[PDB]
């Protein structure tokens, strides 16, 4: 509250560290559905139906130029990849299943970086 405050978390390293899980999601060999923005003129349903896309360049973009205001909205946009996949993508598909994988790998990054 007023005057009160918890012990400073050193944040100091985020972006740089946050730079390199993507590097390392953007290198893995299941990352082919999630390197580029899926091409709304060309996947039927994919605009009406995915209210907020997101893809690693674009998450890379937002990383580069002071987008993320923290840790937090940088995890928000990986995770949102995720989910959009969940959502248009059969679990038993190529994509599907490049998704599940992405996400475990993420996760595991995640906690071992920051928890």
Known sequence: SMSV??????????????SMILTEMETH???????????????????????????????REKLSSGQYPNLETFALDVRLVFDNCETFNEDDSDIGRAGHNMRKYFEKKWTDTFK
Do not use: H, Q
């Open 29 to 59: 060999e299941d990352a082919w559905p999630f390197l580029l923005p899926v091409n709304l003129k060309l996947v039927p349903g994919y605009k009406k139906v995915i209210k907020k896309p997101m893809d690693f360049s674009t998450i």
């Open 5 to 18: 405050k918890k012990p400073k978390r050193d944040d100091s390293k985020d972006l740089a560290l946050c």
